[PDB]
Structure formats: structure tokens, C-alpha cells
A paper describes a structure:
Lysophosphatidic acid receptor 1 (LPA1) is one of the six G protein-coupled receptors activated by the bioactive lipid, lysophosphatidic acid (LPA). LPA1 is widely expressed in several organs to control cell proliferation and survival, cell–cell contact, cell migration, and cytoskeletal morphological changes.
Here we report the 3.5 Å-resolution cryo-electron microscopy (cryo-EM) structure of the human LPA1-Gi signaling complex bound to an LPA analog with more potent activity against LPA1. On the intracellular side, TM6 is displaced outward by about 8.2 Å, and TM7 is shifted inward by about 4.1 Å. Specifically, R1463.50 forms a hydrogen bond with the backbone carbonyl of C351G.H5.23 (superscript indicates the common Gα numbering [CGN] system), which is typically observed in other GPCR-Gi complexes. Compared with the C and NC states, the Gi protein in the LPA1 structure resides in their intermediate positions. Instead, M153ICL2/34.50 binds within the hydrophobic pocket.
Author numbering:
A (entry chain S): 2 to 121, 136 to 247
B (entry chain B): 3 to 340
C (entry chain A): 6 to 54, 182 to 354
D (entry chain G): 8 to 61
E (entry chain R): 23 to 239, 251 to 323
Write the structure that this text describes.
Amino acid sequence: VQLVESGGGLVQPGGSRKLSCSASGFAFSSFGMHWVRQAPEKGLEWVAYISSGSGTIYYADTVKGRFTISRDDPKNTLFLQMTSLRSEDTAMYYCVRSIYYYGSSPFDFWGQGTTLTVSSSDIVMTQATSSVPVTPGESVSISCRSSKSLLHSNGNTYLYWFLQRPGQSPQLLIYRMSNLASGVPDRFSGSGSGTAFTLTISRLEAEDVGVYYCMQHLEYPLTFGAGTKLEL
Amino acid sequence: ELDQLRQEAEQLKNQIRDARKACADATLSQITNNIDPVGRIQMRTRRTLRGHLAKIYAMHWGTDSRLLVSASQDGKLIIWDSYTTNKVHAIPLRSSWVMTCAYAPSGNYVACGGLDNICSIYNLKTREGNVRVSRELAGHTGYLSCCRFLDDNQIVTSSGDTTCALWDIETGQQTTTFTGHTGDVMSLSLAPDTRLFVSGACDASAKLWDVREGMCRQTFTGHESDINAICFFPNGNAFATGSDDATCRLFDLRADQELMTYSHDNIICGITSVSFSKSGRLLLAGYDDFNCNVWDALKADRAGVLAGHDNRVSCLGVTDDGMAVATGSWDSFLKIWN
Amino acid sequence: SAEDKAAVERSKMIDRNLREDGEKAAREVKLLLLGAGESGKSTIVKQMKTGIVETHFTFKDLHFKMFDVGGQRSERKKWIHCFEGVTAIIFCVALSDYDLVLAEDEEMNRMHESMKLFDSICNNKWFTDTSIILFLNKKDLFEEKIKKSPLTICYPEYAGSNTYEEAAAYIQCQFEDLNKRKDTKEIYTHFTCATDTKNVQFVFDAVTDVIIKNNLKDCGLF
Amino acid sequence: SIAQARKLVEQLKMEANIDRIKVSKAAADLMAYCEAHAKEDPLLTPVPASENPF
Amino acid sequence: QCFYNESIAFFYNRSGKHLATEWNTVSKLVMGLGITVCIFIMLANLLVMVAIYVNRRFHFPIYYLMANLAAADFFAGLAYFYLMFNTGPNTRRLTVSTWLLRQGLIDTSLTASVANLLAIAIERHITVFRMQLHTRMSNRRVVVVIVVIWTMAIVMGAIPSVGWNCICDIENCSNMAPLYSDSYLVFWAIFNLVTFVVMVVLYAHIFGYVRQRTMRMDTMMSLLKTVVIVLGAFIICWTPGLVLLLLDVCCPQCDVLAYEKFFLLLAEFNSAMNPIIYSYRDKEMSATFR
Ligand SMILES: CCCCCCc1ccccc1CCCCC(=O)N[C@H](CO)COP(=O)(O)O
């Protein structure tokens, strides 16, 4: 079920390079794919998205009309065509899979991403905690704030959570508030409503130390939050 | 000798019949004479699910009362979202001849079977996001008519080989086999506590089974023809059978008798499906009249009708919370009535 | 919602696969097969190419699906309604079963048992419109059988010699008299030809006739 | 057919050897449960569209 | 040089036509037969449309085009009914706009009827030539062909009402319709002629296909009876009118005005016979008549 992407490396500004992500080990034809980039020192940032069968293609503000994203279902590959790279496009480009149906878990699996170094009305999520000190066996809570009521009419608070261990791809923990992802221990839990959100860990270990992220999915372009690194 | 046991056996039916009369103190119709009626039950088609290209035989609600399953002869198993009418999964079957469905209580599994004599179990929550078939329970010699999950590992099935079975999905062998039916078994219903289950057969009898021991506790007669559908009362102390005599009957397990018959002179076609209301006050029965009747389960007065289908109403199920009733039919449409 | 918008994309992506699969299944021809245990349905299936057996074969760019449902051995009253809407009902009867008898019953002929099955099927409320192809197998073995044994053993009344041509012709017409829907369904009776492989071609011609005649019904040109 | 008859006779003997309650009391119990959960029944008392998921 | 100044009198007197200021035996006769035919058309199509809508059995594309034929023939009945109560001395009360109203109603109604006959022929060919049993059919092709028929009928009935007429060339236009041009009459009549030869080839292909395939294995008598009566209604109710219009536009000094008022009655009698030609065979629908 691994996802690997190809390309990146060193490119002079204004050059056009292509990123290919070869899906292997799952039903790629029925998965809506994303691209998410992380700056060398900054947090995550959504860029693109394709629905199942290339029915719906969206983009970020900074890459609108600059990036072209395509999928090749028979070969189980995903493509990104980048045009006229700027100095502000230096980031690690993860590839994310997501499937949308009643009760599904979008953004469950993240690729390893590629390193790209160029030579030289939007919801804002805010968390003002960084490098928080914590000890193993204690209880820690991570708070998040939104600028908009994420609680939709149907009662779905489209707020997600992620955990990025040092030197690893981001990993889903909570796909909607008061829900727990697959393969993650029961210690992680999240309770919140409207614009106030919390992530409570009962007892932690050396394995789950790292930086945490908050994402909304109420409407595009899926703005992320700043990091929240647990210090140990 | 055969005649010794037979003249003996026909005596044992007498003490059963003798004791049942002695316990027939007063008819439920006499006891419920002064209960205020339910009133006209006007129930309208809220949602209509389209996408089947053949006649539907089976449907089953989810324990969350929102998702549901349906199978048809088009060889497709579809998991619906009743709120938004949008398809969640469309499972292709190896065998187009499917006569039953079950949606696991956990909603991780769905099971279907039919003339292929196999109960196929499909895994819904799968890392690779494509419903895959988990196990194929092949131990029956006749068409499967019904199947109901106990847990994610125990499923009980009734077949056309006059036998019911309790399965173990991991090993794919019958943990227990229920024998004693002299006709083809048509449907089974599990008790609320999942310790007992009643089965209806083509021999015009219903048997109460014990899931652990595997022996039949009681047998109820009274119908005149095939029993096509069966469901417990919500409290698990009663159940109702739909037959081809165009009568529904409410049997008691403690009193071991028949209480009501829901017959109307106008109705002459056979009952295909029955189901109760969350309070047990309404008994919804899906007839071959192309329509579906709603019976007052303590007055035996036909209060309400659900006529929206072109062909016969094959399946009929109510939600756990009782907020809706969904009926399938051979016209290839599921309708959600509320 | 953003999630709900992507959800509806699946439902449309599902529905387009169902239509494509539905339009593929509509072109397929569904034949129901019946007969006695020793009819030769086994031998017919060999020429064309537990539970319900399906055989898929193609002839002249037409796809046939033959549903040998002989192995159900349960009450036909509950599951025969599953097969309403088949193009045709192939029916196999062994002509060499006129002088025989079932291993269970005393002197009730296999051929008279074939008629009892035929009577219930041709007049079944589920197959009021459905055409019947009627194969009569083992015709050469019947010729040897009739040349030595009389035909009076099965039919008490019979005006005609022990000649294959007349002996068979009585049986064919005797089978064709079972249906009361004379002007609704057409019975296409064939004598099994081994080497020629015309049995499959006769099915082709019999199926098109049922399709062509039906096409004339719904467009009103009939 | 001797075995089938012998298995048959002990089946009813077990079936006859059960405690049977009067239909009088069992009739009341079905009346009691329907009225006790009557007001939790969507189909018996129709619910306004504000609390109706359909 | 274009003249909308003149009245109807100028146009008739320019042509060979006669105004008939006074009532006539022939005028009363044609008014009676026309009103009879119009009443028959209106009544017979009301039955067909009511039956085609009330029965759930008759809810399939073929019956949809059958009901569309009933509606088009009802529209024809209305056009011919309005043309009556406007003939003989009544025509003298007309103006150019109103007369064009009358003739445009006639054009669009008959064009719609002929297009429905061709559409029913094309549909029968499609239904016969499919190699499937049930084929649960959509309502897409039927409503698409229904809007093509009506769009073509309206544009055909409006073209002479706007642009294609002899308001501008007095010398080069018809003898019977004093204002439509020889170009328009040729166009309409060749359109109807090619439509009839298209219906003749399609039904011949249907008969040939059914013959070959079913004779490889009585339906032949029923099919040939139905085919022969469908083409014959059309030929015996149109060939008169079409040959008459071609004579008008091709032969000078061919006295063609003489048999005009009865040939139009024959063309409307076609639409009179259509609901019963297309409903006599269907035992069920025919009986539905109550
Ligand atoms: C305009 C051409 C369309 C196409 C031909 C229609 C047709 C068909 C078959 C016979 C006739 C026609 C029309 C002929 C004019 C219309 C009329 O009404 N004429 C009569 C003939 O006596 C006078 O009407 P009026 O002058 O008394 O008002």
C-alpha cells in the first residue's frame, strides 16, 4: 500500500519539472489524490487535488494556473506538471490519497514525498503552541482555533489532525472530531465544537514525539495550521 | 416397530395440544378490546433509491439506521446512504442468483447468498479500498434463503436443504447445524439478545432454536401454507410469521401459542416480508398485492397502507431507531417511508 | 460540503459502472435448461461448448448463458420465479425413455414423467410469455428401440406402425399439446443431431425468432 | 426409517416438557411493552420535520 | 420591387383565382365536409391522447410518438377548422397578415404530421433491428425526435410567413397560393416526396429482415398487411396534392386550381385516418377505447 513519488532535486528558477507518484498495492483508480508541500522550516500547505476519474481538479492560490495535475489510472501513477518555478516553491512534496464516502477516512495514507529545491474567504487555522515541553507518562492537550464555524449543518466538524514524527511522512490520527484513525492507539482523542478544538493524549512515549498539525476540510483550499512540536 | 413409535408420537402431539388449550385463558383481541386505536397511519415515500437493473430480493438496514444494503438478480450488491440517496459501494457478485442480504452489526461486513448454495462474506473496511470477498461458507446443499450475523465471526444461515446452520467465518465450518424442519426453510430472525432464533419453513411450521446447544426448543403450527417471513417482537418474547395463506400470525414463546391472525377478506396474495415497529405496535407486512400493509399489532385492524411499487414488495425493513421503513420490490426501486 | 461534494462524485461514478455493466448484461442471452436426469442435457451441454451451473458460449456474435439448474433438488415453487425473463427454456427429453421406468416407481414411465414436468413448466404463471425450445435426444437409440419393441407400452392408444418417422412424430405432437398458451408462446422442437453440430444452430435460429417476434410486439408492428 | 422416528419422539417429549404461561398474562406483557415504549416510536406518532432525518 | 400595400383582391386578380363574393352549393358542400372531417379528427385524437396518457401500459417511447401523432393531427384538425369559416365569401374579409396566419397553421400542422410518420417509421426500424429481449428504454431519443419534428414543423410553417414568398416577385410565384413562391412549393413537395421514399425503404428493410430471419426458422401476412396499409394511406392521400403542386410550379396552362379544394380535404382525411391506422392493430389499446 506504499506510495512513492519521483522527481524533485535541483532546478533553476523558471524551469518546468514534472513529479510522478507511482501508486502500488491499492485500488488507485477509486482514490481522490492530493499534493501537500512542506517548506524546509515551515508547516504543511495544500496545493492540488484530483477526484476519482479526473472529474474535479482544484488548486491553491499560490499555484493556480501554474501547476497541472494529472493521473494515469491504468499505470497507477499520479503526475504533477510544474511551470515557471519561483523561489517560494522550495518544499518537500508529499502525495496523499483520500476517498470520500459516508464514514470514510480521507488523508489516511501519505507518500514519502520528494525534495525540490529551486536555485536562487480562506479559512485560517491558528495554534500558538510550539516546542511544548512534555514527559513520557504524563497527559498533554494540544489546542487549535479556527476563524470559521467548521461545524457543518449535518453535524460534521470537518477538522482533521496529523502527527509528523521527526524524519517521517505525516500520519493521520483523527479524521473528524471525536473520531480515531485506523492503526493509531486509543491514547489519542479529540473533543471540540465550532471554532475551538483540542487533542488529548492520555499517556505518550518516545514513539509519538514530534510535530502535530491541524487541517480543516469544510471548504477548499484546505488551509493547514502551524506546527505544534512536543519537546522531549 | 414403526407403528409403536408412530402411535406413540401422535400421542406426544396430544399433550402439547392438550396443554396449549389449558393455557388459552383469554384471547389477546378480548384483552386489547379497550386499547385506544393507533389512528390512520399516513406514511409517505421520503426517499427513492434508483440504480438496480433487475428485481430486488433482499435488503438490510444498518445498526446506525442510516446505511442499507440491497441485492438483485443484476448481480450487484449496493450499500446505500439513505439520507443522501448516494451509493457508497457497488459489489459485483460471482453469482447473479442472490436471494438474501445481511449487514453486520459492526458494519465491517456484508453477506449475501442464493442458488449457488454459498454464503459469500464481503469485507467493507479494507486497506486497499475495494470491497473484497472474505470467506465463502459452502456447506449447504440447497439455495440459501436467509442469513443473519451474530458477531463479525458468527453468522447463522437457513437454506433450501431443510436445515439451518451456525457458522464460524474464520474457519469456514458449521459450528452447529439445526435439523428438524420437514420443508424448505425460508427465513430466520435472531432474538434481541442473540441467544435464540426462530426459522420459518415451507412445511407451514416455525421452530424456536437455541444457538449454543443447537436443539429446537419449541415448534409453532397454525399456518396453512409456506412461511415466507419471520421477525421477533422487539422484547424477544413474541414473533410474527408471513405465509402464503395471506395471513400474519403473532406467536408467543412463553405461552407457546398463537395470539393474532392478521387476515383480511380483500387480501388473497401471499405475504413476502414482515417487520415490526420499534414499539411493537405496528406490524408492517409486504404482500404480493404490489403494496404493503401496516397492521395494528394489538388490535388486528389494518390501519395504513404503503402502495408505491409497480411489482411485488420483496423485502421490507425498519430501522433500529424506527425513524423509517424501507421496502424493496421487483420493480427495481427501494423506497424509504417515514 | 467539500466532503459531501466528493461523495456525490462516487455515486455518479458508481452509476456509470452499473449502466455499463447493465448494458453488457442486456446483450447476453439467458437460456434456462430443464429435463429429466437422463434426458441428455449433459450431452447437449458438451455439444454447446453443486448448485446452479452456468455455461457461457458465443455463436455468430451472440452471447448465450445457459443455466443448468438440475442440481437444486429443492422445491421449484420458491426459486423458479428467479428465472422469469429468460429468452427461452431449453427442455431435453430422451426419446429412448418410452419403454423404461424410474428406479423408484413401479411402472410409471420416464416419458410420462417428462410430460408431467413439461405440463407444469409450459403452463407456469412465471412463463406465460416465455418460448420453449424442446430438444428430443437419443433419437438414434430410439430408432433401434422402436424397431424391436412396440410403442403401445407407453401410449395405450396409437394408430401407426413401428416406424421411426411416425413413432417420433406422434411424440413430438403429443408434447406440443401440453400448452394452453397456444397463441402466446412458440415451442421449437428439434431432433438431436450429433456430428452436424446443428443443435447449437437450431438454438440460434430459435432464439432470434423469439427476439424478432418480440421486437415486433413492443413497436406495435404486430 | 426407525432412527428418524426414534429421534422424532424425544423431540416432542422435550417440547412438551417446558413451562407454559397463561396467554392472559403474556397478552398483558405485549400490551405493557408497546405502551411503555409508545412515545419513543417514530412511526406510531409522526415526528416534525425538524427531528426527521428524511 | 415589393408590395405589401395591395389587399387580397390584388393578389387573386393577379393570379387566376376567383374570390367567390357570394355563397355557393360547392362552398356549402366543402364547408360541411371540412367541418365534419375536422370534428372527426379532433374527437379521434382526443380519444388517442387520453388513452395513451391514462394507461401505465402505454408509457413507452413508441406510444409517446403515437400520442405525438394524435396531437399533431389534432393541430391539423384545428388548422383546417380555422381555414373553414374563412373560405368562399369569408376569404374576402382577409388581409395579408391574417391569410399568412391561416396558411402557416396549415403548413406547420401537415409538416408535423408527415415528420411524425417518418419518426414512427425510423423508430420501428430501430426496435425491430435490435437483438435483445427486454431493453428497458430511456425517454431521451423520443423527446429529442419530438423537438426536432416540432422545430422543423414551426420553422417550415414560418419561413414563407417571413422571407420565402412572392411579396417581392409577383411574376414568379404560385397559381393556388397567390403569395407562396414556386421555390417554396417545390421545396415542400420534394421534402414530402423524399420523406415518403425514406418511409418506403425503411419498411422494405424491415420486411426483408423479418422475411429472411424468421423464414430461416402467420407473422408474414400481418406484417405485409400492416406495411401495405401504412404506405397506402400516405400514397392515396398525398400523391394527389404533391403532383398537383408540382404541376402548378412546373407546367404552365395546366388548369390545376380545379381539383385543389378537394385534394386539401384528402390531405386532411389522411390525418383523419392516422389515429385508427396506428391503433387498430394493438388489440389492447384499441379495446382501451371506452
Ligand atoms: C400553401 C401550400 C402548402 C403546401 C400544399 C398544401 C396543399 C395540399 C393539398 C391541396 C392544397 C394545398 C394548399 C393549397 C392552398 C390553400 C387552400 O386553402 N386552397 C384552397 C383551394 O380551393 C383555397 O382556399 P381559399 O382560397 O378558399 O381560402
